């Protein structure tokens, strides 16, 4: 009956930010104290909630979104931000009620020669809506000529590899992000901290 936060945080490999994973958390008691009382997280920003109280509230549903981005891009995982990640990969809403948790994962997600697993979307015509997920690999038409599914000039693959190398500057190293959003609806609450 304890929420499977370890399945999310301690997962062996994370998803690419363009294809971010979402785990629905329900029918469990949370025990957020394992998270906020850890020295491993370089980022623990909460919005609309106080992290200390978290073991004394209930929410009707909890979502845990996880992905990997650059260290310099963690600042974009926040309400009202812009940039490649917030515009084309993962968009938080302005009234986001939840917490953003990030930590350096250079030891796990970087390979000598470059880790070409983790991708981000570079080309898109419009910004994503909040919590929108776009996994299309359609060739991006940058000019007036149609692409017909063939890469070329003015016709680019929309995804790019980070190529995480262990010797990158810290801002260029991979960071694992977990975004908890807390739902409050007119329905029974099925996620609660231990105290309540």
């Amino acid at each position: 009956n304890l929420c499977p936060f370890g399945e999310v945080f301690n997962a062996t490999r994370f998803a690419s930010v363009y294809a971010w994973n979402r785990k629905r958390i329900s029918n469990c008691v949370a025990d957020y104290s394992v998270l906020y009382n850890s020295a491993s997280f370089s980022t623990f920003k909460c919005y609309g909630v106080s992290p200390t109280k978290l073991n004394d509230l209930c929410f009707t549903n909890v979502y845990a979104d996880s992905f990997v981005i650059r260290g310099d891009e963690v600042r974009q995982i926040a309400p009202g931000q812009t940039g490649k990640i917030a515009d084309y990969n993962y968009k938080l809403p302005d009234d986001f009620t939840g917490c953003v948790i990030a930590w350096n994962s250079n030891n796990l997600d970087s390979k000598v020669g470059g880790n070409y697993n983790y991708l981000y979307r570079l080309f898109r015509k419009s910004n994503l809506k909040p919590f929108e997920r776009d996994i299309s690999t359609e060739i991006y038409q940058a000019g007036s000529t149609p692409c017909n599914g063939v890469e070329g000039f003015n016709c680019y693959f929309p995804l790019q590899s980070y190529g995480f190398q262990p010797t990158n500057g810290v801002g260029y190293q991979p960071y694992r992000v977990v975004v908890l959003s807390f739902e409050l609806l007119h329905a029974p609450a099925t996620v609660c901290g231990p105290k309540k």
Partner: antibody
Framework: EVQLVESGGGLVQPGGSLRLSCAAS????????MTWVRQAPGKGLEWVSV???????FYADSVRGRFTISRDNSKNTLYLQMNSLRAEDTAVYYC????????????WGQGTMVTVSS | EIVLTQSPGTLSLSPGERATLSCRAS???????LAWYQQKPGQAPRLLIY???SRATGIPDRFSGSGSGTDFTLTISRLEPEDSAVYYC????????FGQGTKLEIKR
């Protein structure tokens, strides 16, 4: 044939305003990262601003709050609105298409001269 | 910010020789975000290399870029008179900054 044709350069008194245009052909401005890059007489290149296809904009520290990058899809034209111009804004300004990791600044305009002087 | 310093400031080499131009960053950049441009007199900059080692369209194999971390190099073998220009390095990962330039003069 891919072409960026710029216009709007001229003489302004300090504190005055100017607006540059970059008419594109062979490139859909609204679908690209579009940048302005300037070069003061005798010096190197300095990035000015960028506008994303989705509409996000970013500016260099030396021009933020005074410059505004924008576009008009119907004319396929990039714009740079310059306000509160100072003598150090005197430069040849270039518009460039930006492909980032897929190719950097691959297409450049011919440039227009901007002179801020009393 | 990331500051790119190019060395040397001026080069004077004979045709057919090889030119080695350096770009040094104040902090390490991913090679995926480095670029080299050539600017001939009275002309707009022309992209030579993107991503450290990748040649732009129409750029001959005579130009080759390399480097990692804080150090990147542009090499122009078999120099010709029309290689006389100013060469700029650029990074576009953390914002966008350019180097001051290296002016290549071709001897005769």
């Amino acid at each position: 044939e891919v072409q960026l044709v710029e216009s709007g350069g001229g003489l302004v008194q300090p504190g005055g305003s100017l607006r540059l245009s970059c008419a594109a052909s062979g490139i859909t401005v609204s679908s690209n990262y579009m940048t302005w890059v300037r070069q003061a007489p005798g010096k190197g290149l300095e990035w000015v601003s960028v506008i994303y296809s989705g509409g996000s904009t970013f500016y260099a520290d030396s021009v933020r709050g005074r410059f505004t990058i924008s576009r008009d899809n119907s004319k396929n034209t990039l714009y740079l609105q310059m306000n509160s111009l100072r003598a150090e804004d005197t430069a040849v300004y270039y518009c460039a298409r930006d492909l980032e990791m897929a190719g950097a600044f691959d297409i450049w305009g011919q440039g227009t001269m901007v002179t801020v002087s009393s | 910010e990331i500051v790119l310093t190019q060395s040397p400031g001026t080069l004077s080499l004979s045709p057919g020789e090889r030119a080695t131009l350096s770009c040094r960053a104040s902090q390490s950049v991913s090679s995926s975000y480095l670029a080299w441009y050539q600017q001939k007199p009275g002309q707009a900059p022309r992209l030579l290399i993107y991503g450290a080692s990748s040649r732009a369209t129409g750029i001959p194999d005579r130009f080759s870029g390399s480097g990692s971390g804080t150090d990147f190099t542009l090499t122009i073998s078999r120099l010709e008179p029309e290689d006389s220009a100013v060469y700029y390095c650029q990074q576009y990962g953390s914002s966008y900054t350019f180097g001051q330039g290296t002016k290549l003069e071709i001897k005769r």
